């Protein structure tokens, strides 16, 4: 079974794959969510729009994309394919 992953391999990719259809879908999924997160942080001081900044407990200075991928792991997001 998956032993405690570390660094860039966490969360396990194979568990993310079941939350999407193909690897490419996960790429864009996570990238768009990361743009949303970075945008919340960047313009949090002013009147944030529909951007829902972090949803899973953010790390102290967790990189945006990492928060996004973890959110996808916890089934905290939804997507509509092209």
């Amino acid at each position: 079974g998956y032993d405690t992953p570390l660094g860039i391999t966490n969360p396990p990719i194979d568990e993310l794959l079941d939350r999407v259809s193909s690897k490419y879908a996960l790429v864009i999924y996570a990238a768009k969510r990361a743009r949303q997160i970075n945008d919340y942080y960047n313009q949090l001081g002013e009147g944030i729009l529909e951007y829902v900044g972090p949803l899973v407990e953010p790390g102290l200075q967790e990189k945006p994309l990492s928060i996004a991928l973890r959110e996808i792991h916890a089934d905290l997001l939804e997507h509509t394919e092209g």
């Binding site: 829902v52 949803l55 905290l76 997001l77």
Partner: peptide, 7 residues
């Protein structure tokens, strides 16, 4: 929607 409300 569920997580959005949970924010």
């Amino acid at each position: 929607e569920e997580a959005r409300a949970a924010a």
